[PDB]
Design an enzyme around this catalytic site. Sequence first.
Site, PDB file in Angstrom:
ATOM      1  N   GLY A  65       0.805  -1.212   0.000  1.00 16.74           N
ATOM      2  CA  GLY A  65       0.000   0.000   0.000  1.00 16.74           C
ATOM      3  C   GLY A  65       0.838   1.263   0.000  1.00 16.74           C
ATOM      4  NE  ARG A  66       2.176   6.066  -3.369  1.00 13.90           N
ATOM      5  CZ  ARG A  66       2.155   7.376  -3.637  1.00 13.90           C
ATOM      6  NH1 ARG A  66       1.170   7.918  -4.347  1.00 13.90           N
ATOM      7  NH2 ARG A  66       3.133   8.155  -3.178  1.00 13.90           N
ATOM      8  CE1 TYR A 125       2.090  11.816   8.266  1.00 15.17           C
ATOM      9  CE2 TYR A 125       3.541  13.159   6.876  1.00 15.17           C
ATOM     10  CZ  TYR A 125       2.508  13.061   7.810  1.00 15.17           C
ATOM     11  OH  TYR A 125       1.887  14.197   8.283  1.00 15.17           O
ATOM     12  CB  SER A 126       5.372   4.841   4.871  1.00 15.96           C
ATOM     13  OG  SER A 126       4.189   4.107   5.118  1.00 15.96           O
ATOM     14  CG  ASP A 182      -3.690   8.245  12.727  1.00 16.19           C
ATOM     15  OD1 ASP A 182      -4.884   8.544  12.453  1.00 16.19           O
ATOM     16  OD2 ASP A 182      -2.814   7.994  11.857  1.00 16.19           O
TER      17      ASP A 182
END
EC number: 2.7.11.1
Length: 330
Positions: A45-46, A49-50, A155
């Site tokens: 995945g995207r 931040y990473s 989060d």
Amino acid sequence: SGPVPSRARVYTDVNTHRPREYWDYESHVVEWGNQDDYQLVRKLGRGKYSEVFEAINITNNEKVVVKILKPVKKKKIKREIKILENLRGGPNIITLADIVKDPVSRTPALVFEHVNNTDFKQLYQTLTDYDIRFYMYEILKALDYCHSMGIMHRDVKPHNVMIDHEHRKLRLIDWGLAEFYHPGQEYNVRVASRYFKGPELLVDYQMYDYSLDMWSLGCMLASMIFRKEPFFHGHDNYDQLVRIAKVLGTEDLYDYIDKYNIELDPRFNDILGRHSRKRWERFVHSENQHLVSPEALDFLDKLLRYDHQSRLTAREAMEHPYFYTVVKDQ
């Protein structure tokens, strides 16, 4: 005169009693692992931040998850790393296994224990009343652990909870926004995802604490029991508070801003209006009936309060009647 101060009702000074090395992340020295240890298999995945990949540790042929960081302040990387290392071994907390330099991005790549997970898309679909109780209880373990250790997640949302349903195994992940709690500190309010942001974040009250995580958990529970994901679906930060206000009412909201002498953004004037507090029953229909109980509503009510001081702590939550049957089972 400016806003009234606040402190956590619980785990207030845990960090003060630690050695400064524990929370003084800016002075943490990364000790690099060997990047040739890991061969990338496929992209998972995207992130904001990473980039996240599945990989093999060749030295021991074990499956791992590699998080290649986008450029970000070294401060922020030291934080996440420090928090992850402080929390290692804690119940349902994702385990950091290694840290390496990506040869291609020249940035850090964190290497995590692999978790074979069911998509919350296809999962919150098939969950029984009991499953939800079970998994919420497992999340509460992770939150009571990290709060007891002086850390707020900041989060909590469904993306950040990894569930291996076959093995009834859960991990709290993505510690990138997590902070050390200190009495008196004023935090950035630009944390969490919109649908999960506490009222404190929305009215700009910076002296918040662990209780933030409990709001977010309320949002998750609401969306599970009532089958509406996300539950509070605002289109922006101002519309979010209005969506909350339309459920929890404006009386307690204004009571809240009053208690803490919060200066409300002039933008909020024309839009908040006047709303009554609604009974949870109005979200109960035939599709979600089987997940909603009086226990479940009493519990949710106790998580979703404007005044962050009045929300349950992770530990009090864990002894709510809603979980009586999962407690007996263990």
